[PDB]
Design a protein around this ligand. Structure first.
Ligand SMILES: *[C@@H]1O[C@H](CO)[C@@H](O)[C@H](O)[C@H]1NC(C)=O
Ligand SMILES: *[C@@H]1O[C@H](CO)[C@@H](O)[C@H](O)[C@H]1NC(C)=O
Ligand SMILES: *[C@@H]1O[C@H](CO)[C@@H](O)[C@H](O)[C@H]1NC(C)=O
Lengths: 13, 189, 179
């Protein structure tokens, strides 16, 4: 199986 | 190099209870050691942990697509990855090697310490007990505690302070998920 | 809870160092070699059963870099406070003369994630056969790290793990010797 990546949210400005 | 440092951390955490029956997902953001904002699957939105994270909580919560990504994570991320790694993580089991040897509390003195060295086991949950002639000895027991080796194995030393007498038989007994019955090692003076 | 899986990431300025790894119950599943753009499994066996697209780690680190800039600015450029490590040296099994063993240097409870670590044999630096882990996350959001030195135990050799960290005034030496 393949490990999934949770993504990191981009902050404003 | 005395230049100031600045550190950002992110931890995406999946917490499992009863297999994958109950799952919690945490999307956690940190500045230095300070968690400033988090998504808790129990809530379904980001919440500021400190004053520093309020703008992020508000901005991210205004993005419905982002929130739905995070809300589905317990399934598409947590439960998925559990399935991927389960055979060699959740199901990983290695018995301990057990050795008993005498030692000294102080260098000059006769042997007054019995060491039960329990090495190479996984997972960390373990119970080690000392017996003197078939009776458990609960006094004078000191340990290193549980030591991680960093390579998916643990060890622990469990020591019994005692003055061995001729004829006495001491037994170290080890219980562990990898074992189907207690593992025992005897030591005679 | 029975188990916890954590995808832990960091980015550090001005060093421009970024790390990405997975943790299971306090042990490392894998990390991504950012320079090589490759997945490094902690145990080789892991990679026979699973795969990971290293590129996704790269994307996350890029976001973390951009996020750090913003946060640094937001905090009015408040820098990290150095927390010096606790260092412990032990062997992975009971020591017997001329029976192959491994020295472990455990570097724990520190931040930022930057350290210089040297193994010394009789006061001299040794590098043959040494290995090390990446920076591993703690629940208090400090870090820990392991360094390893395979060795042949003898009455003639003493060892030290020397750790340099910005939170230390001088390098920390933890000693090991036979019996
Ligand atoms: C755990 O999950 C199983 C179903 O997989 C269920 O039957 C059991 O009652 C659950 N609860 C526990 C053990 O607390
Ligand atoms: C940064 O400076 C601004 C302007 O004074 C202030 O509003 C804010 O509270 C400061 N943040 C910190 C944590 O120093
Ligand atoms: C590691 O060593 C180099 C030079 O030897 C130095 O510039 C750097 O600051 C050191 N890092 C730490 C954490 O001491």
């Amino acid at each position: 199986g393949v490990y999934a990546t949770r993504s990191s949210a981009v902050r404003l400005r | 190099d005395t230049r100031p440092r600045f550190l950002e951390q992110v931890k995406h955490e999946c917490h499992f209870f009863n297999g994958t029956e109950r799952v919690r997902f945490l999307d956690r953001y940190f500045y230095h050691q300070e968690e400033y904002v988090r998504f808790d699957s129990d809530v379904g939105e980001y919440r500021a942990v400190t004053e520093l994270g309020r703008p992020d909580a508000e901005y991210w919560n205004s993005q419905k697509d982002l929130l739905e990504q995070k809300r589905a994570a317990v399934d598409t991320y947590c439960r998925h990855n559990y399935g991927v790694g389960e055979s060699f993580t959740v199901q990983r089991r290695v018995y301990p090697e057990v050795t008993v040897y005498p030692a000294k509390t102080q260098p000059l003195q006769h042997h007054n310490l019995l060491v039960c060295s329990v090495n190479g086991f996984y997972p960390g949950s373990i119970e080690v007990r000392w017996f003197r002639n078939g009776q458990e000895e609960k006094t004078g027991v000191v340990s290193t505690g549980l030591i991680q080796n960093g390579d998916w194995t643990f060890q622990t030393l469990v020591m019994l302070e005692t003055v061995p007498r001729s004829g006495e038989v001491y037994t170290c007994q080890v219980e562990h998920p990898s074992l189907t019955s207690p593992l025992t090692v005897e030591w005679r003076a | 809870e029975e188990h916890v899986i954590i995808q832990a990431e960091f980015y550090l300025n001005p060093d421009q160092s970024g790390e990405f790894m997975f943790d299971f119950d306090g042990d490392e599943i894998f990390h991504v070699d950012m320079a090589k753009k490759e997945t490094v499994w902690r145990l080789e066996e892991f990679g026979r059963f699973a795969s990971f697209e290293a590129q996704g780690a790269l994307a996350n680190i890029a976001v973390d870099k951009a996020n750090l800039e913003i946060m640094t600015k937001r905090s009015n450029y408040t820098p990290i406070t150095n927390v010096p490590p606790e260092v412990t040296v032990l062997t992975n099994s009971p020591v017997e003369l001329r029976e192959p063993n491994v020295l472990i240097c455990f570097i724990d409870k520190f931040t930022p994630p930057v350290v210089n670590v040297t193994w010394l044999r009789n006061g001299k630096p040794v590098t043959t056969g040494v290995s090390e882990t990446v920076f591993l996350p703690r629940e208090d959001h400090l870090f820990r790290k392991f360094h390893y030195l395979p060795f042949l135990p003898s009455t003639e050799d003493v060892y030290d793990c020397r750790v340099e960290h910005w939170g230390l005034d001088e390098p920390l030496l933890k000693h090991w010797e036979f019996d």
